Amino acid sequence: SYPLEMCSHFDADEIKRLGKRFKKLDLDNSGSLSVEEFMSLPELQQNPLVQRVIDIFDTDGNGEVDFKEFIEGVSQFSVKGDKEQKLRFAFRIYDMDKDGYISNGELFQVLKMMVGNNLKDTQLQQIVDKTIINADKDGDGRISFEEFCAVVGGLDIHKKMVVDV
Template structure:
């Protein structure tokens, strides 16, 4: 299992790792985060639109396939999301939304991606050009920009190249989103709902 993490963990210093471990143990006293806990953490019900995305994200984090995210997987994911290069984040994002695992994004998968991004970045769409304000319209624009061979699906290369050459796409996907802040806000919101 350790072979997945050796190149990334060295970028996190010992003090940070210890602090992360303390937080992980508090949130996951069993030593692992299971899918139902992962969904609960983000307030995602099994019937919601975000459920499939959450399951796909969870699987991408669960590198050894044991149906839980252990501490090393947790650290590797945080390192990718907080410190990873934009190209690596895009590869991960592509993998998460390629829900059928065929190596391509079709229009349905792309619409789910855009809807999820819109949900994460609540209120952002209000500041967009109104001509591209819905996830469907944004998905259509993305497909027009990226599907270079017009085969009705996006390869990983088309996806990465498209995002890297288009300012609107980079802003829409914003691979540099502050996930730490977003996670903290959702955790605080969830804890407030439990208390209230």
């Protein structure tokens, strides 16, 4: 029954509202959302990016999502959030080990989650390869966040990553 620290764009209200939505989802009322509980959502199972989000949200990497991580996780999409914050999030979709770079095999696997059988593995591998070659400005063979943004800044997809709370 101690108080809870977090960093986010929300005020007491939006946080209180989010808390009701959190309680509703916590079935076992354990205080931290499991993947099983997430996937209980009908719309959600039709979605290849879900566990990425969950894995990104799960800051502590324990496999669930406590309320702090829940809030900070959403806060990313707040209308008050800026361009970089949203882009940084996107980056982390591809950066599976969270080491801060997007590796080759990583970029492959993540894409594979999204295209599935609409591509032969060799084809996917190739565009995956050439992408890096053309974006790896530093020659390391993976992708920094700086280099990532170099490709996509002009796309303003970040403007599409907004939710009303």
